[PDB]
């Protein structure tokens with residue numbers, strides 16, 4: 504589908520048996536999700552952005568469905584005010600920017 | 603043009619009569635550029651990102667050429683890791699997400 508940018512590009516995602524709203528973010532290298540108790544091993548990581556860095560937990564090979572499109576990859580979990588779908592997953596669902 | 607996301611979506615912009623590189627970011631509501639001198643008066647403002655809030659200078663009605671396309675809107679200048687072109691300007695050039 505085609506998504507206009509008049510409003511934040513929020514879509515429904517499915518991860519770890521849960522439905523959430525997430526922001527399609529072409530400006531994010533990674534996918535960062537709100538704090539959630541996912542099972543499995545994780546490794547500590549530090550990621551940054553505008554106001555500085557935050558500590559997050561890195562989970563690998565997590566199945567995730569974005570707007571009905573299946574994907575699988577690395578997700579970072581931490582204290583973020585919003586769920587962000589970064590380029591690592593956007594490329595998997597064939598997402599492109601057009602103008 | 604159609605831009606894939608395997609690499610960061612960086613484009614060249616011309617502003618204040620000078621060239622710079624910026625990121626086309628669908629996740630950003632506003633446009634934030636690295637510290638630089640811009641004609642006109644500015645107003646102190648604060649914006650939040652991942653990591654926290656920062657103090658920026660707000661310049662209104664600034665003309666900016668993005669990859670050959672003209673736009674005129676609000677631009678925020680402050681201590682940012684990279685130049686980000688947000689939705690306020692992306693909408694002006696007719697940018698959309700597609701998959």
Ligand SMILES: CC(C)(C)NC(=O)[C@@H]1C[C@@H]2CCCC[C@@H]2CN1C[C@@H](O)[C@H](Cc1ccccc1)NC(=O)[C@H](CC(N)=O)NC(=O)c1ccc2ccccc2n1
Nearest residue numbers: 530531532533550551552553629630631632650651652683
């Ligand atoms: C620019 C501003 C208007 C303030 N908006 C935002 O920052 C909003 C805020 C929203 C609410 C909080 C959670 C994030 C979302 C999306 N972001 C947009 C969002 O696109 C933002 C843009 C950006 C890119 C690079 C540097 C700074 C800022 N990206 C990010 O925050 C992603 C997060 C990540 N690790 O994937 N950062 C990076 O992709 C990234 C890349 C290289 C870097 C080098 C040095 C330091 C930091 C670096 N961060």
